[PDB]
């Protein structure tokens, strides 16, 4: 029922260090009882008693250091604990936890903040929670400067929280903000943060810290705290300050509090070429980057030369919905649950029209099977960024857009029950693409071309027209601009007021509007050549999506974009290749509508603009040059 | 819009016209633009801003939010993407993988619009939040790439072009936070005399004539410099 | 190449059978290799004294009617600084800001290999009526 | 698979010459390769890598090589059935037919296009059972071990990609998994290569990042003495940036003066080994040969991290050298770099003529074929900048702050240099020597927008040093483990850095 703090004396620089420890020793001596532990020769970093462990009531969880350089202090500290009547707990030798440096109680005693990411393990937070019988709120540290929680996090009395948000990821910041109101948050500016302002000791209203900015001290005083500064720069040279040099043994106990953990643990299995592709490594990076942890359990190799490898991984996540995100990202790369843990998929009924329940699963491009009524059901109409609707009486599962969701539909929820089944010497990529196009053209496969006005500006109208003539184009997706530029180059011998807001654009548009559309204007011998001419003549379906920039649109240009998206999905169906010659906006939408199996050729002159999730091939050249090379190479398969 | 029997001028007779940089030079251009904006704001002048998701991607959500808050933005022209990314950064502190986008859209669709989600306490901060709170007219033009969309985004582009022309009417300045498609469309809709500020990190500053000013920096950095300089004509 | 003691010796021995330097030695075309701080190893031919290299550059530039500048930005500015105005300067690169040299000078914004391939093709269509 | 080729020979008592196919269209040898009688060979060279093409050319004389143009190759011209005097193939070019007739072969064409639509032409439809009898293997096999976190890093994937891309093959043995992240899991892999030279080449890149031979197979190193001055033995080992140990007289010797693109010279009585440039090599020096016995071992947040690192290293850590170009001056960075020099953050300066003339112009004439010749001439009058600083002509700037606080600088010459300042070296061997001198003992190097220049300076630097490279293009961003690059304006980077280091220490 008092305040007891454990400290350890430090038995050119070193003289100042001794003085500073003494200066700190008395300051805490003014506010609490200071127990000492005998130092040891060979363990100088033993002065940072916060890393000894974590004390609550009578139980102490001894720390398990990450690195070997401070593990030798673990026994001596344990000795002290046992000599003073504490029930010492030890963690598995594989499970590191660095004590009160990475676990700070809320001053009222409601819960325990515990950090993970650099030196302390997420998988250790359940151990601590069970052994001290308290709630553990997990936060991930992301900044190497603050690898310890007590260097960027300082719970204060009065419900206040003094911390440096940039040391935490987005999820941890969301958690912190959920628990601490903004009036109770004292944000630290970076200059203070790097000087370990959060490494401060708070007893009731007193805060003992090293030297910090006047502005921080005044912000603290406004909340009712009285700051007592003491020099500790010598310990700052060792990544320690006032909080690190102390360990509070008398922590408050709220008997209504028991062990609590948000952490979820799951085992996943991954079979396949996990050695070459590096898919297992990508999986583990996905887990960590999404604020999770892992332990690779079994890596079983198949036959030993080049056969398939199978592996088991335990995956931990601090939040259920962090587990959801991690699990979706893993499922895109196989990652089936262990064969005995296989569950079926859960669904929820649609109450609002065109809205889904929040926990609904978001579809990806890859082909998926869902386990409905204990059977694997292949998902139809695979598209990314959609909901999966399941029917019970027959076995179906389909992807459907959010707006198309109808009331009473059963939409998949959760993650259970899903399985997934400028550069030169371009001419080499052109050879490969031409051969693949010949293959898809000979057998019965749809090739779709998405085009933009860049095709006309770069001299590619005639080549694309030839591609349409020779049956290489089964659908055309474009916009107002390319159609008006193609027809302008066909009629007047010039696109964009130059050799293929000018007046030629409007005159061409005006004529085409007079005929009521491009097809009629072709029939009245007004359009004799071009991409649109060959599309109408050889009867290739095309769709011209509208744009906010569209000038007095051609009758064919679809200005209702829901209809345009529907028609785009219609023309894209059953495709084997997609030739994308346009700006990103058009190409990104067409890609968002296509499944993974389709071959994507993305050509553009911007080197950074060739970004598409190999199944997709990207080229950074002039699109007209690509078209000329492609036509020549395709002729070499006919000549 | 031509109606039957309209007499349209023809020919040429009888018509007459009364009419990447270093940060060092960027801060001078920003000083000039900030001074012009302060002048136009201190009178009853209209400033219209056309924004793209790049404003959000580069950390410029807060700065554009400040500009809307401090009365420098009288209309907003944008699309689905910028709204969903602003609302995502406001809710979850991140933006752009794709999953978080749809959930946000679904949430907003559940409330039936951005205004409903603002009054229901779902959107507490952001550009769209400040537009709804401070009563700024905005128009979200649709695109074929649009997911959802949000209930607010006009998916019929003739209607969207009309609303764009409406919001453009009384303008003295147009801040273009370059969406190349958006910037060219809004420019084709704007008359002469208006000052055009075009910002992009690309040499996409193909801005026809001064009648204006183009900047080649990071749009978020541009917004930071602009807010800093404008907070000096407020002290 | 250092063991053979130079590019000419390495060509005459038969270690270098093809290439630009091979054709320069064979058809007896004068070349000058200016040194750089980045040089990982000087070919015996590479001039490491840059006053001598500048003198040799001015010598070889004399009486020139055209200068084809193929993707040496550092070199292109120096050789231009050495050249008088009467000569036509062809500067080819994808940068494209290093194409800004200033009708008596032509700048081309493409890949230099493509430029060379197209140039050889057109020069064939010009000197091959056979 | 290459590992199938030893079996073939053993089972057939025959020699196997290995060729690596690189073209996805011709994944079968008989789709791009057709040996003909009379020593003639009808083939398409682009279907093979450089090493395999070199092998083919070494084995077949030019009078005996029939190269096909791309049109024929894509028409599966090499997929032809050959009787000693007859060659049966699909429809081929007339010019090809004339060359084929030039050899003693008579072309008989027959259509097989329907099968060409499925990957096969005439040769694919046959198997010759009467092969004549008129055992050797070129492949080299080795097992190597790598000790590191193979899963928590792309160690295995990068290693195996190196192996395959260098025209080799591999086989991963059983993965031994640890109990925890502290027990590193490591594995040994069989590595095969078609040529001795290719095995050696694979091993050098493979030797980088550990890859130690099994404990029982090799503790020696081979050497050869330098017979020609300023030359090296043909098989001399090329040094890398990473720290290396060599096994001389069964003992491990660390190499001193580690630099990339150098030779390793070993002495026996004094058992050390040092890196030496080819030109500096003296006769009778023993240069290491072969591969045996060698072993190794964000908008603004990045600026915050670099500033923290600079504060760390400034406190009596190690020399800091900055390489500067005229881009530093063009973007308004003179004053910030000068401040960095004043506050002890710059221990040496590496630059050129241009940056010096531009800095001194900004200091003398302001103005935030040109005036420079006036400025250059003025500086020429004093006989150098240091003298020009001691006189009242240069009072401030980067060069002034370097001269006053006595920071060693070296201005390397270039062919672009306008009539050079007296301080500019202009003899580039001397300049490289001084550059390596000034780099000595550095812990961090600020590289400010000189891609050719910065890469040249970096190649002179050892591996351990952490490097920051700044440019507005991702072109001047090389890298390595310790070193991160920035995509900002170098002047903005300098302003942010000076601000972040200010009030901090």
Short mmCIF file of C-alpha atoms in Angstrom, two decimals, chain A residues 267-497:
data_model
loop_
_atom_site.label_atom_id
_atom_site.label_comp_id
_atom_site.label_asym_id
_atom_site.label_seq_id
_atom_site.Cartn_x
_atom_site.Cartn_y
_atom_site.Cartn_z
CA UNK A 267 -2.00 -22.73 -37.68
CA UNK A 268 -1.89 -22.65 -41.48
CA UNK A 269 -0.38 -25.05 -44.00
CA UNK A 270 1.26 -24.06 -47.27
CA UNK A 271 2.11 -26.64 -49.94
CA UNK A 272 3.92 -25.88 -53.16
CA UNK A 273 7.12 -24.38 -54.54
CA UNK A 274 7.84 -22.49 -51.32
CA UNK A 275 11.61 -22.74 -51.93
CA UNK A 276 12.09 -21.26 -55.43
CA UNK A 277 9.34 -18.64 -55.76
CA UNK A 278 10.00 -17.58 -52.18
CA UNK A 279 6.31 -17.79 -51.34
CA UNK A 280 6.93 -18.84 -47.72
CA UNK A 281 9.14 -15.77 -47.26
CA UNK A 282 6.43 -13.57 -48.78
CA UNK A 283 3.92 -15.15 -46.38
CA UNK A 284 6.04 -14.37 -43.33
CA UNK A 285 6.66 -10.80 -44.50
CA UNK A 286 2.90 -10.40 -45.04
CA UNK A 287 2.27 -11.63 -41.49
CA UNK A 288 4.79 -9.27 -39.88
CA UNK A 289 3.93 -6.19 -41.98
CA UNK A 290 0.28 -6.60 -40.90
CA UNK A 291 1.33 -6.41 -37.22
CA UNK A 292 1.44 -10.17 -36.59
CA UNK A 293 4.01 -12.71 -35.47
CA UNK A 294 4.85 -16.24 -36.52
CA UNK A 295 6.82 -19.36 -35.69
CA UNK A 296 7.55 -21.76 -38.53
CA UNK A 297 6.62 -25.15 -37.09
CA UNK A 298 7.32 -27.77 -39.77
CA UNK A 299 9.09 -27.37 -43.08
CA UNK A 300 8.64 -30.71 -44.86
CA UNK A 301 10.34 -31.03 -48.23
CA UNK A 302 8.88 -33.46 -50.76
CA UNK A 303 11.31 -35.25 -53.06
CA UNK A 304 14.66 -33.64 -52.65
CA UNK A 305 15.69 -32.36 -56.11
CA UNK A 306 12.86 -30.07 -57.27
CA UNK A 307 9.62 -31.41 -55.79
CA UNK A 308 6.90 -29.53 -53.93
CA UNK A 309 7.53 -28.41 -50.34
CA UNK A 310 4.89 -28.34 -47.59
CA UNK A 311 5.06 -26.33 -44.38
CA UNK A 312 3.24 -25.51 -41.15
CA UNK A 313 3.19 -22.02 -39.61
CA UNK A 314 1.61 -20.72 -36.42
CA UNK A 315 0.26 -17.21 -37.04
CA UNK A 316 -0.55 -14.78 -34.23
CA UNK A 317 -2.30 -11.44 -34.54
CA UNK A 318 -3.16 -8.91 -31.83
CA UNK A 319 -6.72 -8.31 -33.08
CA UNK A 320 -9.34 -10.62 -34.55
CA UNK A 321 -9.68 -8.28 -37.52
CA UNK A 322 -5.91 -8.09 -37.83
CA UNK A 323 -6.11 -11.88 -38.05
CA UNK A 324 -8.79 -11.42 -40.73
CA UNK A 325 -6.56 -9.17 -42.83
CA UNK A 326 -3.52 -11.44 -42.37
CA UNK A 327 -5.59 -14.49 -43.27
CA UNK A 328 -6.96 -12.94 -46.47
CA UNK A 329 -3.43 -11.97 -47.52
CA UNK A 330 -2.22 -15.52 -46.82
CA UNK A 331 -5.20 -17.21 -48.52
CA UNK A 332 -4.31 -15.41 -51.75
CA UNK A 333 -1.17 -17.62 -51.70
CA UNK A 334 -2.73 -21.01 -50.94
CA UNK A 335 -2.56 -21.19 -47.12
CA UNK A 336 -5.26 -23.73 -46.32
CA UNK A 337 -5.99 -24.52 -42.63
CA UNK A 338 -4.66 -27.86 -41.36
CA UNK A 339 -6.79 -30.68 -42.80
CA UNK A 340 -8.40 -31.47 -39.43
CA UNK A 341 -9.29 -27.82 -38.70
CA UNK A 342 -11.19 -27.25 -41.98
CA UNK A 343 -14.44 -25.42 -41.33
CA UNK A 344 -17.19 -24.28 -43.68
CA UNK A 345 -17.95 -20.70 -44.64
CA UNK A 346 -20.21 -18.43 -42.61
CA UNK A 347 -22.77 -16.12 -44.18
CA UNK A 348 -25.05 -13.26 -43.18
CA UNK A 349 -28.23 -12.01 -44.80
CA UNK A 350 -28.42 -8.65 -46.56
CA UNK A 351 -30.70 -6.24 -44.69
CA UNK A 352 -29.93 -3.03 -46.63
CA UNK A 353 -30.11 -2.99 -50.42
CA UNK A 354 -26.70 -2.80 -52.04
CA UNK A 355 -24.92 -2.83 -48.66
CA UNK A 356 -23.11 -5.75 -47.04
CA UNK A 357 -22.52 -6.70 -43.40
CA UNK A 358 -19.25 -5.15 -42.26
CA UNK A 359 -17.37 -8.40 -41.64
CA UNK A 360 -17.99 -9.53 -45.27
CA UNK A 361 -15.08 -11.12 -47.14
CA UNK A 362 -13.61 -9.02 -49.96
CA UNK A 363 -12.96 -10.97 -53.16
CA UNK A 364 -9.60 -11.07 -54.93
CA UNK A 365 -8.68 -11.72 -58.56
CA UNK A 366 -7.60 -15.31 -57.96
CA UNK A 367 -10.06 -18.19 -58.52
CA UNK A 368 -11.58 -19.34 -55.25
CA UNK A 369 -13.53 -22.26 -53.81
CA UNK A 370 -15.73 -21.89 -50.72
CA UNK A 371 -16.88 -24.73 -48.45
CA UNK A 372 -20.68 -24.54 -48.33
CA UNK A 373 -22.62 -27.42 -46.75
CA UNK A 374 -19.34 -29.33 -46.28
CA UNK A 375 -18.61 -29.28 -50.03
CA UNK A 376 -16.11 -27.30 -52.09
CA UNK A 377 -18.03 -24.90 -54.36
CA UNK A 378 -16.22 -23.09 -57.15
CA UNK A 379 -16.88 -19.35 -57.21
CA UNK A 380 -18.34 -18.03 -60.46
CA UNK A 381 -17.75 -14.65 -62.08
CA UNK A 382 -14.43 -14.09 -60.34
CA UNK A 383 -13.66 -10.39 -59.87
CA UNK A 384 -11.70 -8.47 -57.29
CA UNK A 385 -13.33 -6.00 -54.89
CA UNK A 386 -16.72 -7.74 -54.71
CA UNK A 387 -18.82 -9.75 -52.29
CA UNK A 388 -19.33 -13.51 -52.58
CA UNK A 389 -23.00 -14.57 -52.56
CA UNK A 390 -23.78 -18.23 -51.87
CA UNK A 391 -26.96 -20.19 -52.63
CA UNK A 392 -27.95 -23.00 -50.31
CA UNK A 393 -30.41 -25.17 -52.24
CA UNK A 394 -28.15 -25.65 -55.27
CA UNK A 395 -24.38 -25.45 -54.73
CA UNK A 396 -23.29 -22.08 -56.17
CA UNK A 397 -21.05 -19.21 -55.09
CA UNK A 398 -20.66 -16.01 -57.07
CA UNK A 399 -18.90 -12.66 -56.91
CA UNK A 400 -21.30 -9.70 -57.03
CA UNK A 401 -20.67 -5.97 -56.80
CA UNK A 402 -21.73 -4.18 -53.62
CA UNK A 403 -24.34 -2.10 -55.45
CA UNK A 404 -25.82 -5.22 -57.09
CA UNK A 405 -26.35 -6.95 -53.71
CA UNK A 406 -30.03 -7.74 -53.26
CA UNK A 407 -31.91 -7.99 -49.98
CA UNK A 408 -31.88 -11.43 -48.37
CA UNK A 409 -28.66 -12.54 -50.06
CA UNK A 410 -26.26 -14.68 -48.04
CA UNK A 411 -22.84 -13.01 -48.26
CA UNK A 412 -19.64 -14.59 -46.97
CA UNK A 413 -18.35 -13.17 -43.68
CA UNK A 414 -15.06 -13.75 -41.91
CA UNK A 415 -12.17 -15.76 -43.32
CA UNK A 416 -13.19 -19.37 -42.58
CA UNK A 417 -13.85 -21.86 -45.36
CA UNK A 418 -12.12 -20.16 -48.32
CA UNK A 419 -9.44 -21.70 -50.55
CA UNK A 420 -7.78 -20.20 -53.61
CA UNK A 421 -6.79 -23.12 -55.90
CA UNK A 422 12.22 3.55 -70.42
CA UNK A 423 13.67 0.21 -71.52
CA UNK A 424 15.14 -0.97 -74.83
CA UNK A 425 15.36 -4.42 -76.41
CA UNK A 426 11.59 -4.41 -76.16
CA UNK A 427 11.52 -6.48 -79.35
CA UNK A 428 12.07 -9.60 -77.22
CA UNK A 429 8.90 -8.93 -75.23
CA UNK A 430 7.23 -8.13 -78.56
CA UNK A 431 8.31 -11.51 -79.97
CA UNK A 432 6.89 -13.33 -76.95
CA UNK A 433 3.64 -11.34 -77.03
CA UNK A 434 3.20 -11.84 -80.79
CA UNK A 435 3.68 -15.60 -80.43
CA UNK A 436 1.24 -15.78 -77.52
CA UNK A 437 -1.31 -13.74 -79.49
CA UNK A 438 -0.95 -16.11 -82.44
CA UNK A 439 -1.58 -19.03 -80.07
CA UNK A 440 -4.70 -17.43 -78.59
CA UNK A 441 -5.95 -16.42 -82.05
CA UNK A 442 -5.61 -19.86 -83.64
CA UNK A 443 -7.50 -21.75 -80.96
CA UNK A 444 -10.84 -20.15 -80.09
CA UNK A 445 -10.00 -17.42 -77.59
CA UNK A 446 -11.15 -13.85 -77.04
CA UNK A 447 -8.56 -11.06 -77.21
CA UNK A 448 -9.72 -7.70 -75.83
CA UNK A 449 -7.98 -4.38 -76.49
CA UNK A 450 -8.34 -1.33 -74.27
CA UNK A 451 -7.16 1.74 -76.14
CA UNK A 452 -6.61 5.42 -75.41
CA UNK A 453 -5.93 8.53 -77.49
CA UNK A 454 -2.18 7.87 -77.15
CA UNK A 455 -2.64 5.17 -79.81
CA UNK A 456 -3.57 7.84 -82.36
CA UNK A 457 -1.11 10.54 -81.24
CA UNK A 458 1.84 8.15 -81.60
CA UNK A 459 0.98 6.95 -85.12
CA UNK A 460 -0.66 3.66 -84.16
CA UNK A 461 -4.09 4.01 -85.81
CA UNK A 462 -3.21 2.01 -88.93
CA UNK A 463 -1.48 -0.80 -87.01
CA UNK A 464 -4.38 -1.25 -84.58
CA UNK A 465 -6.73 -1.22 -87.57
CA UNK A 466 -4.67 -4.03 -89.11
CA UNK A 467 -4.89 -5.92 -85.81
CA UNK A 468 -8.68 -5.55 -85.97
CA UNK A 469 -8.76 -6.71 -89.60
CA UNK A 470 -6.74 -9.89 -88.96
CA UNK A 471 -9.11 -11.02 -86.20
CA UNK A 472 -6.82 -10.20 -83.26
CA UNK A 473 -9.38 -7.86 -81.64
CA UNK A 474 -12.57 -9.43 -80.27
CA UNK A 475 -13.63 -6.43 -78.17
CA UNK A 476 -12.59 -2.78 -77.98
CA UNK A 477 -12.78 -0.75 -74.77
CA UNK A 478 -12.06 2.94 -75.10
CA UNK A 479 -13.41 6.42 -74.63
CA UNK A 480 -14.66 9.53 -76.37
CA UNK A 481 -11.16 10.91 -76.96
CA UNK A 482 -9.66 8.03 -78.93
CA UNK A 483 -12.74 7.76 -81.14
CA UNK A 484 -12.77 11.45 -82.03
CA UNK A 485 -8.99 11.44 -82.60
CA UNK A 486 -9.11 8.32 -84.78
CA UNK A 487 -11.96 9.73 -86.86
CA UNK A 488 -10.24 13.13 -87.11
CA UNK A 489 -7.04 11.50 -88.38
CA UNK A 490 -9.10 9.43 -90.83
CA UNK A 491 -11.11 12.39 -92.16
CA UNK A 492 -8.70 15.34 -92.15
CA UNK A 493 -5.31 13.62 -91.93
CA UNK A 494 -4.45 15.10 -88.53
CA UNK A 495 -5.17 14.31 -84.87
CA UNK A 496 -4.95 16.90 -82.06
CA UNK A 497 -4.62 19.76 -84.54
#
